[PDB]
Write a protein that binds this ligand. Structure first.
Ligand SMILES: Nc1c(/N=C/[C@@H](O)[C@H](O)[C@H](O)COP(=O)(O)O)[nH]c(=O)[nH]c1=O
Ligand SMILES: [Zn+2]
Ligand SMILES: [Zn+2]
Ligand SMILES: [Zn+2]
Ligand SMILES: [Zn+2]
Lengths: 359, 360, 359, 359
């Protein structure tokens, strides 16, 4: 029964899916005398938390009742009384938490606020799905680095274009279309300058249900990005460029004018780890790395990815000189190439979508 | 439905020939008189009785006024013994259920005609698709004069065949190499470029429990660079045909021919793929399993010489420009010129994923 | 996608099962710009309705929003404004209703009420599920009688006991446990005194969380019930009895003191139509008739049942004097035996549950 | 592999189903140097055996090969060399027998005959499957008694007619047709006179090519069967009647002179063990009992049945004086009621088909 209630809270939590953005998915359910009296979930960013909705709905039935939470109630004092505080102020007898707040220092603080108030706190109830619930958010809080998704599309023989650079029909509209989803479940979209110089993409989420465009990150070592590029001029969404001291001073000035954020790395070449650290320090919790087989290579080589997604088309391109999926340095010996694990393999239209993860 | 049941049986009996019938296609036959099965047959051995002989014999006198289900058109040529359409006619059978006609467009229907001339009802097309899968390759050879080509390869998830240094030790799983082995059993030949011989020195032999008459080994060469050293040469475990060219030495040429090793020679300085298969199609080879060489695979691909693409991806990323890839060589320069295929299968095998695709 | 929401609504309704007493289960979800902004369900008798909870949660987002409701929003003016009104005043622009009110005096009332406010109303999405959800309740309101389920356990040859009355071991523990589910989805459990004499059952619900117990109803023509049976002494659940004028007046007194409520019918034989009418008047909307072969026979003769559930065990009890499933008068010609329709066939343990319905 | 061949044999054997009359189904596979060279089944009564077909087919290859036989090769020295010898004269080195001959008298002779000749014999391969193949036949041999199947059609509450006797069709047309299949797989059909003088049946297998009608056995305590009943007249299928000494002598002569095979029991009531005894003596290996509530009770009380098949119509008949499935004496105490086991549940039209089996 405590299982049902946690499950209930997990399902209630999934209903927030993609509406809380930076904030995580939390589900709350209040039970009094064996009867559900409160149900809630975090449905919007910067608005009422899950416990809030559950307890107001709980009314006076909250007194001496139980409450299930998918994620340790907050103790964030300030503009509002912490949910941990709302929990005791209502007379909640016992609280069931599935997992602690991933933020290192914050972890345990909410449990402690309620225990020292006399409340019996039981944890770990269905921590398993409560983990898959906020996979990226968790990672970002625990590691301090953004959850990274690498996505690429190619032919069945692993080429991403012909030997003349042609790549007009690799994957079907359905794949490109499916790839778009990931552009709304990530705080940022990252690609190299080559992509921009080559395709001049807009990197914006076209799906007819958006209201918070991801940050468009560009790794541009030498700052050769074309100034007229949509990613600078269409000014539809945020655009951040990472260069080095090899950038042209006046140009950075000219671009910043258009409202472009320019980060000058202190190293002479761009190091992915340094870039990721900065994106976290700036509040980015996830990045969808779309292009630059070289960019992908740098990510793969540094072990800077949590998930890999490749779309394969029923087509053989061939070519000694046709560009492959993972460019760059690459591992020298098989005894050193990290073993991944296939997480999913679903067909999308006529192509095949494979997805693997680390270790 | 009862009709489909009997043809199903027929098809299922045929399969017991799966083993040895050599170039002969699998065939089944069942005779039913007054709603009773009275004769079952299948082609079991090369050069021996056809499914109808066995079946018609087993039915004895019940054949008179009976029905018969054959998964393939009854033969109609005149050799050492009477053909099966004649056998059927002579036996009193009233009606024949034929799943599919003959492959040879020069012989197809010739049998239906005979029985039909003899007043036998000939109903066609029952479980024709299953009967088509049954002898899929044989059917292809007869209908194209060309060997059924299957291209298989194992690689990283990012399409690499080895590291930039040539290392390819732990590329795919033992289960995948196991699954691959099956194919050496459904093909008469095993194609592989000379680079592969000197690369790992393979045997290209089938070790799956139960194997008669090993598949013919085929090494594509140019300068007869095949190292006299060993395996496909001084490993008398089966046949080894080596397609070569002019530049092929004169001395060592006959030196290897001494080990029962064959030596074909092409009048070109490039071992054009379509020429090789056509030669094979002459030598009775009806199927080829090419597993060696990105370049060798490239050729078959650019030439459009394949009926099956089978790739094994491991959950590994190798990357590295200068890391060999699945298919190399010429290839297509324009996307509009890339032939679209069709994935016919997705099967997880161990930690790896095996993808199989087919043309248009 | 419309169905996705209605289904969420139907699932939110299920959380209030057995907490609404006589009211139905209602789910409500307020959707705005592709975002779930409010969720609700009726959780407590006489307490807030689904729409009340969903709109409150929805807050300002209610404006121009859409709301899915599983049962027609109420439209009568009681102590608090009806829900239809609650919707009008909140700014909801579109309403998705699964089904209209079961009452003919109310159906569509609220619908028209909302269109009249300029709101767009669509109907019938997932009507079937919305129909099942409150199925018994629905029946009670449309016919004015409680939903009746007849249940029995017999041997494969249709015997409910041997010729000596022995019925020990006719159903497995698995079957008995599965049958217990109905003691939770029904407001009363009814048997004739015969069952009280032979088995002296408690007729209580003994599943995990069992907040409320169903009303135990005994049919006892002469009030010859044993004064020391559980149904009269355990106090675990309400006990009501139906007798005739022949009952001993001092015994009713004695029994009333134990808390038993007695109903004295004006006829000389108990009429199922009568009792059903009285239970309805008391607000009993569902009856789980555990039996007595004769009791079932009457319920069948009168055609006073909506569901038949027999459990058959892999055993043969012979006997000409062995009691069969349904006794009483029964039908004379195969032309008069009403037809049913097998609704389900489930194996539970080594037994096989067969459930069927009329027409 | 060892078992693959034996499976194929079993598969070949199933092909002669229904075409062998009273003979067992048998398959055979000859394997030479890892290749199937012979395959045979026994397809027609009194014709070539399984081994004979396979041995012929295999021809020259038979020498030094193996042979998988689903049933021990015959060893009687009749008017030709039995299969055991035939195997021997063929050079087959090894033999795989799935199960020995059911006849205790011969069981083994064959296996010995071959072994005593240098043949390596191994029995048991897929013995359980080879046992399901000829269930009814094997039972007969192993017990000297007919395999018996009790079949009945009843209402959902277990009645086989109204208290009037009207069985104007409880089960559906689809139901009766499905039941004929049995009149096809059993060598005899049995009903009591009650059934005869109330339905005046033909008890014939009106299915496809019968090529052999089942014996019609009627139980007549006093020989009161109507001398105008279909079974007595119609000369379509044989008809055997069992009676006691209460029957008239002339009546026995009339009927006997019309073909009826009359058997007289020297006991007051007819005793099932005795009828099965007689029937087995007369060759009859199986009997399909579908008639008589009391007749069914007698078979159940004696324990004389290998299979019970009940068709339940979605109908409720009712009535205390309505005939139930199994009457007779039945079991007085539930601790004496034998435990059966459900074997199959299949819906037929609007009716349900339950089949069970002993222990
Ligand atoms: N009453 C029913 C049955 N009744 C079965 C027996 O009582 C009949 O006497 C017997 O099947 C007649 O066989 P016939 O004339 O040779 O076809 N059997 C059924 O399956 N459904 C029934 O509703
Ligand atoms: Zn909070
Ligand atoms: Zn032939
Ligand atoms: Zn309301
Ligand atoms: Zn024999």
């Amino acid at each position: 029964m405590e299982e049902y209630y946690m499950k209930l809270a997990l399902d209630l939590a999934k209903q927030g899916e993609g509406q809380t953005e930076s904030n995580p998915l939390v589900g709350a359910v209040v039970v009094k005398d064996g009867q559900i009296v409160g149900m809630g979930a975090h449905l919007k960013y910067g608005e009422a938390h899950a416990e809030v909705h559950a307890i107001h709905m709980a009314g006076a039935h909250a007194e001496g009742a139980d409450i299930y939470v998918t994620l340790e109630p907050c103790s964030h004092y300030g503009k509002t009384p912490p949910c941990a505080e709302l929990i005791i102020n209502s007379g909640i007898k016992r609280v069931f938490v599935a997992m602690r707040d991933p933020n290192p220092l914050v972890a345990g603080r909410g449990i402690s606020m309620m225990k020292e108030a006399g409340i019996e706190v039981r944890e770990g109830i269905l921590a398993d799905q409560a983990e898959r619930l906020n996979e990226k958010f968790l990672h970002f809080m625990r590691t301090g680095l953004p959850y990274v998704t690498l996505k690429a599309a190619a032919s069945l023989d692993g080429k991403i274009a012909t030997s003349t650079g042609d790549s007009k029909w690799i994957t079907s509209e359905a794949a490109r279309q499916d790839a778009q989803q990931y552009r709304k479940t990530h705080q940022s979209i990252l690609v190299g300058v080559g992509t921009v110089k080559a395709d001049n993409p807009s990197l914006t989420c076209r799906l007819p249900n958006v209201t918070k465009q991801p940050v468009r990150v560009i790794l541009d070592t030498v700052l050769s990005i074309p100034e007229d590029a949509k990613v600078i001029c269409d000014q539809i969404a945020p655009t951040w460029i990472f260069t080095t001291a090899r950038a042209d001073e006046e140009k950075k000035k000219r671009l910043s004018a258009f409202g472009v954020n320019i980060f000058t790395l202190e190293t002479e070449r761009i190091q992915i780890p340094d870039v990721l650290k900065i994106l976290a320090e700036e509040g980015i919790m996830s990045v969808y790395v779309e292009g630059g087989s070289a960019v992908h290579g740098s990510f793969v080589k540094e072990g800077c990815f949590q998930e890999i997604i490749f779309y394969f088309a029923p087509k053989l391109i061939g070519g000694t000189h046709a560009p492959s999926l993972i460019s760059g340095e690459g591992f020298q010996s098989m005894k050193d190439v990290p073993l991944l694990q296939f997480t999913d393999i679903t067909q999308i239209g006529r192509d095949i979508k494979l997805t693997a993860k680390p270790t």
